[PDB]
Specification:
It is classed as virus. Keywords: euryarcheal virus, SH1, virus. The entry is titled "Cryo-EM structure of SH1 full particle". The structure is cut from a larger assembly and holds three copies of chain A, four copies of chain B and one copy of chain C (about 170 residues). Chain B has about 220 residues and is mainly β. Chain B has one helix at about 165, and strands at about 1-10, 15-20, 30-35, 40-45, 50-55, 60, 70, 95-100, 105, 105-110, 115-120, 130-135, 140-145, 150-155, 180-185, 190-195, 215-225. In chain B, the strands form four sheets. In chain B, strands 1, 4, 5, 15 and 17 form a five-stranded antiparallel beta sheet that branches. Chain B has a five-stranded antiparallel beta sheet with strand order 2-3-16-13-14, with no helix packed on it. Chain B starts with a strand and ends with a strand. With about 170 residues, chain C is mostly beta strands. Helices cover about 5% and strands about 30% of the residues of chain C. Chain C has one helix at about 160-165, and strands at about 5, 10, 15, 30-35, 40, 50, 65-70, 85, 110, 115-125, 140, 150-155. The longest helix of chain C has 7 residues, at about 160-165. The radius of gyration of chain C is 16 Å and the shape is globular. The chains are: A mainly beta (about 170), B mainly beta (about 220), C mainly beta (about 170). Chains in contact: A-B, B-C, C-D, C-E, D-E, D-F, D-G, E-F, F-H, G-H.
Chain lengths: ~170, ~220, ~170, ~170, ~220, ~90, ~220, ~55
């Protein structure tokens, strides 16, 4: 009655429900406020290699999709909450997306551009640039699905504990 | 010398277990796949062998004048496959039965964000209806138990959010729900599926019309002989 | 060439249907027998369209279990040699024979000779309503898509059949 | 004022309205009645390569679709119309198709198995096997589209006039 | 090892098909000789293998006074391969049966060209009497079908006029019919004799006096074990 | 499922209802009108040899046999319609 | 040295002619693309350069009681890309306009075999309505005309039926039409879209609701400077 | 192996076509000379073989 051992590389996805990320409601027209906020898991490393999908199911309080004019941005920050300018992976609109099938069919899938990597306290943030006419943001009725851990399409996200030379080279930012 | 079978709700034996959870949030055993003497050993492979899970729970309501709508059902509903209208789906998000008339009911429409629905037939005052909607939130995983009854451990301790099984069109290749890890059984040993979430899943409602089992677990697996 | 690429369905005189009670799986639902002069070959990766329904035209319970299984010339199952085992509910009768993305294929190849038998076994729950293969039917394989796969049929050629009788 | 000279191999598709093809309304349960009847066009030669699609948009007099368990058959015959038995290209059903899109996406483009080659008088026939309960055949509302001559997908059929040794080797069936 | 043996209306096997044709001139299947599992193969050979065929149709009339004579029958009548008066023939060109009295009736006289006849007695005014005469024009041939129900070949693709099967006595060497073409059967395959004709044919009329079978098809072949 | 291949020379007969032959009712006493016409089938070739029989059952509208004194003539023509005399 | 332009209903020059066909079923000149002074020469390439054709014709009716339905319009209507229900189609199969109210109509439903449609607003008795549906039957091709007005030669002497342009979702890449043949203009020369169809087709009806042009013939081309 | 003939209003067969044009200034087909099965081919050589036309309205 054995399971079979594992690599340290756990191939998963990322979503609001996990206990190391925070959501937050958003007013009308501030890009600067962080809607999402990952934090480092305090001991493990996350790795999002290139070509990684997103599925940002953002809606209003009334269940409707936001205006496609809004632009979504993902961005790395330091261990204090401050971005770097570089390290950005994604800047686009919701008009690109098909909520009906954005996480389904690879033809419609929207992947990152750059690789990305996370130490025990590193942070990624989501920024949402909106006009005034929007109906804000309701995080309870909205969510995200980052990556795929199920399909023969898309890719996953690697997570690992600290191993010696792996972390020796991984801390080389 | 191996082959591919499916383990499921009933599958290859009438010893597989199916029970429900508690409302106080702390996980419980939903299903137990016990291995029989019929085989030698059973195998799981995440990322290879498909899996399928249609969860469905129970709600109850009493009727009166103007009760065409059903309220927030304590249940986070999602349009299946992204699709909102019922008959365009791979399966119904929700089903309705009048017990007084003892008949199925057709649904008119839905509001997903308010988690409310609108039927076609106005019920009667003093009448009773039950509803079989999908299950929404919750966290799942597998578990292993020896022949004795002791925990050996889990598999890949990253509980999949339940609504993913509702999101994708499970019946389409390439999108089917696979997981991560593997595990091999032995003779009197039992794998289990465990869950935690607020609402009480249900099987075996005799009054349900569209099948003798409302909710199903299925999983392709490999077997030796 | 001698190899013929076709499909298979119920309405053929090498195949037998038998309407079924509720929940008696051990009964042969369907049967395929050899044609006594030709030889059939199936490769793995081959679709099925088991259009099973009730007397009243409605679909069966999704939680049904289906098997295709080889038997000896006697008609007894070998236990091994199964090609398929899954649920009806996995399929979509509206399009289960149409889109390859919804097609569901075998897990093994198969070979039939002048006397071998294939059987179809069907485990249904108690409450449901039988199975009438008059209004229901089946179609196995396709020879039309570049996708999918056909089934090979031959007359007796010496060397290949000489190999084939080493089972 | 130039047009561009041409090869003899005209790449086209075939349909009922052309003046070398005939239709015929049909009852339920004759698999032998020729619904359609092609003939040689009296001097030219036709070649259908193996790997050719079909769209047999067959319906009833009330416009509805036929029974999907219906079987369509296509077959070559002699100059007198007697089928040769061999030289079959097709044996499948209607339920395999999807009239909404059966001539659009290659994932659904049902195609032939073998090649075909028509002399100045050879004939192709199309047959229909149905149970009794159906609402027959109404060719006046139904139609057929053989091959494509417009898309980057599919293939076409080659019409040619008489080039000498081409015909000399072609008649050697 | 083989033998020479005949297939027929009933013959070896009570599965052969016998159906009726169409009035629109579309060549249809008169008879289907299906092969059984009992045998291995069959072989028919034109220019060697004898055949026998008595086709016959069915018409009707109503009675009035003086109507001892029947009009042209929509059928070009022939004498029976040499003879005009029925009593000396191999078989009758036609027979008559009154339904009310419910009896066979004797024929008196013929005009083959005008296709008319005269009977032994006057029917009652208002009675009904049916007639079973031979077939006139039509062209006939042979076809093969696999077990799959799809066509596999017309035999010698040139039909023959039907009339000769009347116009020779079939029970006499030289006069018997030897067609052209050859053909071989298999287990579940079926050969079909086809016809195109103006008129309808019949089998199994309850009121026919001389037997249960108004018409007959027979063919001598070789059989493999 | 075999049939046996054929020699090219198919031994057949000929009759009125075939699609390479045409009938035409004649008036009383017009000989130059062709009652019956036969033309090549456009791709095949026919060969009749001597000693070939005839059953020329010619009748009227009432079917009664004609005047037996009637003369019949059968003749090959050109590709246009003109008889040859020869042949 | 060349680039890619498109010829259009207007195209690169306000000399392109738009005329309509005859009712006597005989082919006519639909459009004349006349090359202008500005350019050097024009090139068409079948199997490279795409083309789009939204034809649309005219019918008219008078109102009275019960006229929620409009007749079989003498046009073999076809679904659009296979699709039927209006709001989901790539473009409307048909539109209609009440003249007296001077407004647009929205449509309930269609029946394609009987070629009829079903509206929402029962028009008034004595009122007038115009309808603009697609065109059905029709065989088109390209013709060449010199500066003199003489026919040089048709392109790829094999017509194109109309209804494929409706059958394919014209905007999807690869699915879009690519006719056959080539042709090259000179300065004062002309090319002519010819059509044969039984129903009269239109352009530039003042009472159209969606745009000042009801029907479009767009084509991709290569151009020299 | 060839000889000469005349095609005409009636000519070698009654399969020709004889129709009239339209008043709108657009050409039509006045006459149609279709070949029969009788002849293998017909040939006209301008500058060699004459043509005659007596039109009348």
């Amino acid at each position: 009655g054995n399971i079979g051992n594992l690599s340290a590389e756990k191939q998963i996805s990322v979503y609001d429900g996990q206990p190391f990320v925070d959501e937050q409601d958003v007013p009308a027209d501030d890009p600067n406020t962080p809607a999402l906020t990952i934090e480092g898991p305090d001991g493990y490393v996350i790795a999002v290699d290139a070509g990684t999908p997103i599925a940002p199911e953002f809606r209003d309080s009334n269940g409707n999709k936001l205006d496609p004019s809004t632009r979504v941005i993902v961005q790395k920050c330091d261990r204090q909450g401050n971005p770097l300018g570089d390290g950005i992976v994604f800047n686009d609109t919701l008009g690109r997306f098909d909520y009906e099938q954005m996480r389904t069919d690879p033809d419609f899938m929207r992947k990152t551009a750059k690789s990305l990597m996370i130490d025990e306290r590193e942070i990624v943030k989501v920024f949402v640039d909106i006009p005034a006419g929007a109906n804000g943001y309701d995080a309870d009725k909205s969510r995200l699905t980052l990556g795929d851990d199920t399909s023969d399409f898309g890719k996953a996200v690697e997570i690992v504990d600290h191993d010696e030379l792996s972390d020796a080279e991984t801390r080389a930012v | 010398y191996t082959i591919s079978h499916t383990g499921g709700t009933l599958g290859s034996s009438k010893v597989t277990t199916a029970a429900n959870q508690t409302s106080p949030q702390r996980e419980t055993a939903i299903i137990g796949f016990e291995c029989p003497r019929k085989f030698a050993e059973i195998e799981y492979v995440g990322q290879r062998d498909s899996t399928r899970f249609i969860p469905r729970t129970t709600e109850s309501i009493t009727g009166t004048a103007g009760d065409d709508t059903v309220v927030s059902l304590t249940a986070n509903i999602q349009p299946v496959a992204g699709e909102t209208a019922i008959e365009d789906q791979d399966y119904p998000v929700a089903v309705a039965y009048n017990v007084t008339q003892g008949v199925q009911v057709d649904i008119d429409a839905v509001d997903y964000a308010a988690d409310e629905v609108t039927l076609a037939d106005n019920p009667a005052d003093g009448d009773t209806v039950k509803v079989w909607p999908i299950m929404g939130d919750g966290d799942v995983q597998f578990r292993l138990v020896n022949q004795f009854g002791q925990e050996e451990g889990r598999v890949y301790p990253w509980a999949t959010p339940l609504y993913r099984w509702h999101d994708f069109p499970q019946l389409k290749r390439g999108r089917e729900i696979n997981l991560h890890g593997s595990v091999t059984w032995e003779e009197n040993e039992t794998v289990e599926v465990l869950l935690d979430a607020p609402q009480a899943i249900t099987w075996e409602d005799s009054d349900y019309p569209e099948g003798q089992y409302v909710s199903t677990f299925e999983q392709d697996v490999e077997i030796t002989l």
